[PDB]
């Protein structure tokens, strides 16, 4: 499923991401935009053999199991395919564990290089929330 900007903002807010660990909703929508372009089915393979899944491009080396990333962990305890669902619940729950880790949203390269230090609120303006 390809979410609309405001549609995603509303779904993320309902799932408790607004101000989660101090990150305003605009940060999460901005990250999703540049990580997957709001597409829940986005997948990208990395040189180390791991793969990123979903709207927030969660990596299989540490967070989910895809059965083809040798000696990787499954910290979110879920098959990576669950992260491609049109229901963002699994992605959100896992993202919450990721951002609670010492490095926060810097864990997402797209956020660090394209959202951090920008006017992230612009991502939710005009939306009914």
Curated annotation (Swiss-Prot):
Species lineage: Eukaryota, Metazoa, Chordata, Craniata, Vertebrata
Protein's recorded name: Lysozyme C
Organism of origin: Gallus gallus (Chicken)
Keyword NADP tagged: no
InterPro entries: Glyco_hydro_22 (IPR001916), Glyco_hydro_22_CS (IPR019799), Glyco_hydro_22_lys (IPR000974), Lysozyme-like_dom_sf (IPR023346)
General remark: Lysozyme C is capable of both hydrolysis and transglycosylation; it also shows a slight esterase activity. It acts rapidly on both peptide-substituted and unsubstituted peptidoglycan, and slowly on chitin oligosaccharides.
Gene Ontology biological process terms in this record: cell wall macromolecule catabolic process; defense response to bacterium; defense response to Gram-negative bacterium; defense response to Gram-positive bacterium; killing of cells of another organism
E.C. no: 3.2.1.17
Family stated for the protein in its record: Belongs to the glycosyl hydrolase 22 family.
UniProt function note: Lysozymes have primarily a bacteriolytic function; those in tissues and body fluids are associated with the monocyte-macrophage system and enhance the activity of immunoagents. Has bacteriolytic activity against M.luteus.
Gene (UniProt): LYZ
Active site residues of this protein: 35, 52
């Amino acid at each position: 499923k390809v979410f609309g900007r405001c549609e995603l903002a509303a779904a993320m807010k309902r799932h408790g991401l607004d101000n989660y660990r101090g990150y305003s909703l605009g940060n999460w929508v901005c990250a999703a935009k540049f990580e997957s372009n709001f597409n829940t089915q986005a997948t990208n393979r990395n040189t180390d053999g791991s793969t990123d899944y979903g709207i927030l491009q969660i990596n299989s080396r540490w967070w989910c199991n895809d059965g083809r990333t040798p000696g990787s962990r499954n910290l979110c305890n879920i098959p990576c395919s669950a992260l491609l669902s049109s229901d963002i619940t699994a992605s959100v729950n896992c993202a919450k564990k990721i951002v609670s880790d010492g490095n926060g949203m810097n864990a997402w390269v797209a956020w660090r290089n394209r959202c951090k230090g920008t006017d992230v609120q612009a991502w939710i303006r005009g939306c009914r929330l």
